[PDB]
Assembly symmetry: C3
Homo-oligomer: 273 residues x 3
């Protein structure tokens, strides 16, 4: 039975789209999630919506309670999580407005708990060393890629996201350096969200929309909040459409072996006395 957690879903919380809408404020061993969980059916698939920075956005990416968010989604029975994120492009070929179905990350965060198994929570006892060779769920990504093609969307089938601590944007020297490291897009939220989802045995995938060229690129306006917001206003409809069309495809795909292997990977990553 699939249940899809949706983070950043802007704007699936719509009475025309979400049937049987119900709201829930949960607590977790790691504190309160960023917002209420919004439950319902989208195209007859059970979904759980969670706004990442709250309903009226008051949280720097550094302070988002990623642990509580993922724990809550796991506790609701989510088998999948699909997230949407804006990002900067570090490659000429990834133009603003393009979607990138990211398949790797590079962590540049510093302040962030990245495990449930922190020695202080008896619902997550021991030490977990989760594999990150393939951080994003391949089958979900394939569906996203296929669906984007059908919709005629500008879409890149792979990409490496560098997640910076923020909340500042990168310097130009940083932007150039990230390019030499192999990063293709840049954001502030993929890590540790993706890591925690893997620990929880959840199939996680990300829809990244490029909104700017960061500040590496000749002749473009360098990134700012207004440049990001402007591109999202002109393009964010694309991510919503991609998600809407993807959800029922996930609902009608077979998952038991994928989910079993994720469960095993998570279980056998934990060391006990």
């Amino acid at each position: 039975a699939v249940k899809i957690g949706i983070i950043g879903g802007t704007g699936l919380d719509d009475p025309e789209i979400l049937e049987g809408r119900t709201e829930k404020y949960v607590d977790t061993p790691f504190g309160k999630p960023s917002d209420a969980l919004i439950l319902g059916k989208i195209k007859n698939v059970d979904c759980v919506l969670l706004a990442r920075h709250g309903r009226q956005h008051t949280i720097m990416p550094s302070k988002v309670n990623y642990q509580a968010n993922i724990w809550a989604l796991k506790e609701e029975g989510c088998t999948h999580v699909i997230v949407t994120t804006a990002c900067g492009s570090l490659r000429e070929e990834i133009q603003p407005g393009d979607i990138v179905i990211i398949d790797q990350f590079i962590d540049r965060t510093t302040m962030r708990p990245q495990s449930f198994y922190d020695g202080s929570h008896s619902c997550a006892r021991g030490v977990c060393h989760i594999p990150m060779a393939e951080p994003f769920c391949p089958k979900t990504r394939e569906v996203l890629i296929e669906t984007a093609k059908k919709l005629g969307l500008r879409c890149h089938s792979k990409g490496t996201m560098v997640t910076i601590e923020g909340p500042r944007f990168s310097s130009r020297a940083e932007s150039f350096m990230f390019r030499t490291w192999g990063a293709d897009v840049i954001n502030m939220t993929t890590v540790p969200e993706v890591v925690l989802a893997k620990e929880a045995g959840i199939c996680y995938a990300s829809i990244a929309m490029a909104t700017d060229y960061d500040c590496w690129k000749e002749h473009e306006e360098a990134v700012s909040v207004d440049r990001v917001l402007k591109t999202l206003k002109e393009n964010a409809n694309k991510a919503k459409s991609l998600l809407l069309t993807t959800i029922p495809q996930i609902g009608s795909t077979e998952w038991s072996e994928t989910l079993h292997n994720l469960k095993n990977m998570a279980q056998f990553s934990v060391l006990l006395p």
Copy 2:
């Protein structure tokens, strides 16, 4: 009305130089600054002096209250901040004793709050994503460069500072890696000082004096505290002279458009509910 905050201005607290001296301890919403603020006029420009690691004090760069320092300077009405820092050279051409008017940074810090807008201070509400394409005030840097030329100083008109967490110096593998990333000089304090100044709408620039070659030469003597102190004793007079001669040039330059654009950049970087 220009007012120049000066960090690491050691020798400017001199009765021959600083007229109308007052000392005071300020408190801020982010705690106490590193030292008392010393107010006065240098060459008929209002200045505010602030020792970065305390007057005598024993504080690692990781633990300097950068937020309080910049907030305090902002609250005193500082329009500009000019800082002096020692640094290691990562380039043969940047010799010990040389000044570098840095124009970029690479952040290698991990422990450091880099924003005033942390969700816990009602004088800095919301989330701020400050642009860092050009972290240092161009007009102040131009004055510094011009003044250094007039003084006959060996001075590099640009350079990328990598700021490490410290307090340890870098390994040789780190030193070589920083060179490959495009870093030219290395220190422990530029980040997050530069970032916070930009959030506060302050024109920030840095005078970096090379004191050593870090450890990327295998044949040459590596950096140590004694090597740094020795070079500063033999050269620090240069940074003082540069600052002294720069201050009245800043006092007599037009700033209203520069400061307006900084104010706008800072204001429109803030997201609210």
Copy 3:
């Protein structure tokens, strides 16, 4: 008088090997070490054995009390520390089971105290900026290399360890990036252990045993806890044999000048008011 601290010392706590075995639970100004100190003589050299993650314990590398561990060893009179660590190989030529006598590191940790001189401790007043040009004791490394050759062990005479925060393993994009930085092996514990040992004036060296190829081969099976444990089970004796044969060579080598220079380096790295 040499005394060798041994961290991760794979089966040296054996009544056939360790003469005069004594167990001791110590406290330090930085808290409790990871396990009891086990004191005794191995081949007539005073040794102090310390398990890094505890005897029956389960603690993330982020939370190991490295300060207490090194302080305790220093307080017992250790002149040398030899550590064993598992690691991932980032180079084809470093095969699982191979030993690497590492000579450099790259720090990718974020959460970790790296100094005793933190402004809050009795025995460690001031600020310490320890040189890290040569983090590992050259003479100990030479003995390790020579001894490995005599034993017929597959052994690499140098290597750069990248230490990641963990507890997660690296992504494939991270693994590839570390290769481009010049890292040869990867672990979670070298930093800050090596840094703190240098601050304490201790001759520190590391025996790294490769257990996997991380995840930088796309065709090959990526690292997991089970893959690491399997390789360790298959390679259980090598590090012990190397250490056993190395210990008396360290005992019969001259150290007074090496230790004097380490003491001086540590002492003159400290700044006071």
